[PDB]
């Protein structure tokens, strides 16, 4: 009885959530191969023990899929420079650690089983880097480029309507660009340009030779007097001073502007045309519903929350304008990133398409205001530092190959699909995650092992064509028991979250929610067939809990009010957040922090970091005499109990007593106390584990912002949502019927 199969009575067990982070299940391969397997932080499967047939997979109920964070920053990476990149003659799989050499001069492909000759240059060919590491990166040549590797090109398209000016994001963006101007990935060929827009479209001529920027204003984006692209997307090094002058002036160019219109559509169409020749990255900053010209959007959100209980009203795009724009951009290797900083509905569902279909990124800062909502301003500052300095890959493509019999079925993420197994990524960034559901078209009886291999081809910021490859090997099994033994619950949950997004949009929120519950009912019913109480194998003991958490997440919840743009953003996050970050949004990590200690702590970055144990998401865990920190992935909350020890309030919060604690507190004082040092050290550790900067909110029991915290205690009953106990009873009833 492997331990992953040890029975767990979920009906009775009140302690199932581990105190420490859940580890990915190690694929059950022999010792030698295990050491060679792919990092689960880069590439993992929902079922580490692969079902031998589609019939067995169907009997299991669990979804078979892959999750990847293909371009994440790595501490070490074997870089291979060879005149010949060895690949299979029949399926083009890259030679890897799991192939077999049948004569030292020939290798058999582990995906299609065809025999290939080993090139002389590749030569003890089995001790080659490609065969000793499952994650490598090749430097490719002319045979992997249709044109010379494009230089880095950056274009900023900024909303300067009165609403946008009032918001005050310009100062933040321009200051960030100035501080990081010499840190943008690229070389001497790097080009950059700027555009602003209100009722008209504004271009900025920054060509070398000018003493100051020349602003060009047009209402017709096809104006024949407009200069050539070389004067708008200029060489960063050559026009450095002109660029800095523009960056210093922008925040004070539209002060108290009379313009209220935001012609985003025309601006983006002009951007497409400008970027078409080279491709690159477009960064769009929008603060309200596009109101003029092509692509203008209506304020269609339905105020009646109950009208969206079964089918979310206006959840899908209102038009295909932005999707079409993104597809056209992808065709020219142009990615479009959206930074939405609106205080009123702006139809993110429609706008998000500009990024979704161009491999772009979506950032959302609701009710952003430099002065009145400074936490969003500081967050943008930090998010921009990462956005502007992280590595980047241009004009990229990614293909995922798999052993014969296996097939890619549905991809999840931001990209332009070009095949059953090929994705076009105008840009590939190190923070993007992807997922894909698989199917078994032909029984996997040929061998006892299957392999999955991700190949990411891109142009580096230095002009080199590179191919980063990840190879994952998994054992094939023929019994249901074994399938349940190798399930990766968090991977399954993340894949189901993506499937639920598709179902909510194409069918209804009701159907998506029902399918999520059905996954639990079906899997545990199927499990029961292999063996008064809801039983589950250890591997799935957290499955019901995670599904309940998902059902209460902003994306799919129906019990409490949810603004449309807010729900859409939650869905966007599911589609692009790597598993490690997405799981915190699905099931927040709760910690008691008024009594942090050394014991258990770890040492990192040369400091002692407390390691408090994870607490289940229920008010039952909230000692009224303590303080707790909830990590929801994108935001932090610190709940302070009415009877919380004053030592904590005084030494950590910086106040005499509970009553003196202010509301709307978003920062922890840098107090010279041991407890403040521990708390801050802990929180700094949390922040350093992810690319984005979560805003911190200190919540008092007094009931104003209390709900924001209690809505995350997903194990408790609420308005129209089951408690964990009730949910299990519900699952049981369905299975017993
Ligand atoms: Zn092959």
UniProtKB/Swiss-Prot annotation:
**Which GO MF terms are attached to this record?**
SNARE binding; zinc ion binding
Instruction: Write down any Gene Ontology CC term.
Output: COPII vesicle coat
Region described as Zinc finger-like: 88-112
| Gelsolin-like repeat residue intervals | 610-682
As for subcellular location, the record says:
Cytoplasmic vesicle, COPII-coated vesicle membrane; Endoplasmic reticulum membrane; Cytoplasm, Cytosol
Task: Kindly list the positions at which Phosphoserine occurs in this protein.
Answer: 693
Q: Which UniProt keywords apply?
A: Acetylation, Cytoplasm, Cytoplasmic vesicle, Endoplasmic reticulum, ER-Golgi transport, Membrane, Metal-binding, Phosphoprotein, Protein transport, Transport, Zinc
Q: Name one GO biological process term.
A: endoplasmic reticulum to Golgi vesicle-mediated transport
- Amino-acid positions noted as binding Zn(2+) in the UniProt annotation, renumbered to this chain: 88, 91, 109, 112
Q: Give the membrane topology, semicolon-separated if more than one.
A: Peripheral membrane protein
Relate the protein's function as given in its record.
Component of the coat protein complex II (COPII) which promotes the formation of transport vesicles from the endoplasmic reticulum (ER). The coat has two main functions, the physical deformation of the endoplasmic reticulum membrane into vesicles and the selection of cargo molecules for their transport to the Golgi complex. Plays a central role in cargo selection within the COPII complex and together with SEC24A may have a different specificity compared to SEC24C and SEC24D. May package preferentially cargos with cytoplasmic DxE or LxxLE motifs and may also recognize conformational epitopes.
Q: How does it assemble?
A: COPII is composed of at least five proteins: the Sec23/24 complex, the Sec13/31 complex and SAR1. Interacts with STING1; promoting STING1 translocation to COPII vesicles in a STEEP1-dependent manner. Interacts with RNF139. Interacts with TMED2 and TMED10. Interacts with CNIH4.
Family the UniProt entry places it in: Belongs to the SEC23/SEC24 family. SEC24 subfamily.
Record's protein name: Protein transport protein Sec24B
Instruction: Write down the species.
Output: Homo sapiens
Which portion of the complete protein is shown here? 518 to 1268 of 1268
